[PDB]
Design a protein around this ligand. Sequence first.
Ligand SMILES: Nc1ncnc(Nc2ccc3c(cnn3Cc3cccc(F)c3)c2)c1CNN1CCCCC1
Length: 284
Amino acid sequence: ALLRILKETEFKKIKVLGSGAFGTVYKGLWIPVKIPVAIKELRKANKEILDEAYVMASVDNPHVCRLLGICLTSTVQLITQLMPFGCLLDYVREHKDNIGSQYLLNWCVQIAKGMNYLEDRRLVHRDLAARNVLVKTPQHVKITDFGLAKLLGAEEKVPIKWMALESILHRIYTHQSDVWSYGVTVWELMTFGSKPYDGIPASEISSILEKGERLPQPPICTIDVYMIMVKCWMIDADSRPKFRELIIEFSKMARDPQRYLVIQGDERMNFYRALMDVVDADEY
Ligand SMILES: Nc1ncnc(Nc2ccc3c(cnn3Cc3cccc(F)c3)c2)c1CNN1CCCCC1
């Protein structure tokens, strides 16, 4: 079965990872052999959920997290493979001094590949952000949490600072609005985890965007890279780069990293063991 319906006794929530926007995520073990997993519990009609869930379990790309199972008790619990290194936002914030140009550019490539794959599956993420990119290994990141937004009425009567103008104003979500969010995610990485429009009230975001104001150029960014970001935030959705084009361009830059990102001491660059702690779901 592509989407395994797990019994409430097959898995167990041990520790709390964090409070998401759609529910609380726990760290746990899935005993079909104990498989380390992340379990998200959301805040019958479960057929729509099971249908939307199926899509989440049928994705097969190395840069996209896949849902492994679901438990429909009093609440809905989503089970997926645990990514021991946590989310990319916290990762860059914590290694702000040992992250080189090579790693940053490759993460941009990987995220673009994962998004292009979702685009091929006609799946709009609706909530791409560095917090929703997980680290399998420092050299391997993956996108997660796609689809949840829609499953909970995102485009029905909110991460405003990551949303495309048209999404804010008209609840219009497309692969091109995801490109906008990709632009912001890239900005979060290049600034080592800064908060976008920090201080600025969410209620005023649409206003400044219409005025042509945009997030500032990250210090390590050459104008070559910043331009890509700005293009992702053009009002005309169809004018924004396509994920296919972003893969090609960041891949180009990944071949000569120090030419596009200026990081002092680049050439020379807690630990999730005692943090997270059995066969890896990947091996299983
Ligand atoms: N370290 C991790 N390893 C694995 N998943 C994680 N989160 C996570 C994200 C989305 C999730 C689940 C379970 N269902 N869905 C929905 C879904 C949708 C699409 C594909 C798909 F596969 C899943 C779990 C974390 C994050 N832990 N962070 C650490 C920092 C504080 C906040 C919590």
